[PDB]
Amino acid sequence: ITEELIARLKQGITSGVDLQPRQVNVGTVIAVGDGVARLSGLDQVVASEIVEFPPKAGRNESIYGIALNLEQDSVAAIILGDDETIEEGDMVTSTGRVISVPVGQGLLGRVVNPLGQPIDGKGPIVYEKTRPIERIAPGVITRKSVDTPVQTGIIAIDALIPIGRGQRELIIGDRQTGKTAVAIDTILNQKGQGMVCIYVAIGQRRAQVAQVVGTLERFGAMEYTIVVSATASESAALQYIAPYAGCAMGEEIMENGVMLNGQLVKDALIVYDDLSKHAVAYRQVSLLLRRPPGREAYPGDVFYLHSRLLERAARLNEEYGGGSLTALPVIETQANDVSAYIPTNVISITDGQIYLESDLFNAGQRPALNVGISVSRVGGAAQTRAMRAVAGKLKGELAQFRDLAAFAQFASDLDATTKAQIERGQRLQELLKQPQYQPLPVEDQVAVLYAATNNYLDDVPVPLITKWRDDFLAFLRTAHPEVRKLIYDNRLDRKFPTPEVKEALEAAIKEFKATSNY
């Protein structure tokens, strides 16, 4: 039926175009700075349009720019591409659209620019809907209390610092501590939990983003992950708009959803890999625009900058779709300077913090969480009833050990109860230690924590506790596959240690301990 093509054509050709010449308003570049153009008299430009810089002699492409400053008789446009080509006298055209990014099912497993242009070299993006960057937060009455848990896969986070769908948990740490490692472990653990992870990679090296994408592809997590990337070499405009593009891509998932594994997934998880670098990029943009600085030279609206970005992460109620968008901002502090400007801003914005300390990271506690200061204001509402019922004693014993943490090397010359508390705390801390790219499912964590809180690892020496776990779960993975399913089935039961699962788990633990020697 080519006649259908001939009929659809030859009709819009004849009467689908005005073809009427008209005066259009353009602008002349009058000063090119360190990535900033002034554009002279380009009227009818919206406060955040994406100007075009049409091709000229010696340039067969177009570099786009954002018209951030609409001054009088001048429009300071931040350049998204490379500024080395735009010269004084160049013509600019004001595309009437605020920056928009493609969204939908098409952008799964693809690495894209903050402008939605693919950079993985696997073909053009297939899409039919573009969502605008910089949209208003969902609203007050549009949300619901966070109840569904986001299974990180790390015992420490998933047991003591719960993350729920719609909760904004901050991963704050000092330089090389494992923030990207924690984010990647969280992303890898959503294989069958019906969630679409997003990784933004603001200001990271191209090599690091490439290795992250390789890790995600190697574990098969690049079939539900969207990777945005504005690397260090790219202009400050791309780093400035990267998290907003990522969260627009995530808002499409939250509101409309995508077909993941033949199921309508409306939950999304987004990881802003460095808001400490996004803030630096925005500071560079502001200072090159000669906007008045503030504390630490950051512009006045830098709290607003991250606030817009993070306040779009919400748990919508059933009326608006029931979707979600979990945000995991990442911050690199300097010498644990929590009182710094950007860390304090994002800490006040977010609903929780995961403090990763270099001291614990170097000591040997490789997941370097500091449970004493790390909080999750959602708390138990972001945990399954099984984990909520089991982790209370874990948290209590860990707190008691922390109160006696100065005493570990003097454990022998202490009270029997104090020595027992110290020993239990050491065992629990060794239990929380976890390798990389080995997330534990919820049933495995529940089983291990039930074995630990109850006096079952007391006979196992501390240096082998980790090994014990790495064996016990394997035992449950092979010898007793039914107990894991039994735990997972009634993980939502109000009284989780129901007699059936209690006897099953007790028998499994006793059978494992009897055979093994430690």
């Binding site: 000669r290 600085p293 504390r295």
Partner: protein, 44 residues
């Protein structure tokens, strides 16, 4: 006697920590003031 001496030393160390915290906070405020003053001077 060692227990009493260490109790007194711990109390003295806590008092010294409080004094040093006050001094550190004063220095932190002074550093922030100096930084913003010089940044505003460079801008103007």
């Amino acid at each position: 006697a060692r227990m009493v001496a260490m109790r007194n030393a711990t109390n003295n160390a806590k008092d010294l920590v409080r004094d040093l915290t006050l001094s550190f906070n004063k220095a932190r405020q002074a550093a922030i003031t100096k930084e913003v003053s010089e940044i505003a001077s460079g801008a103007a």
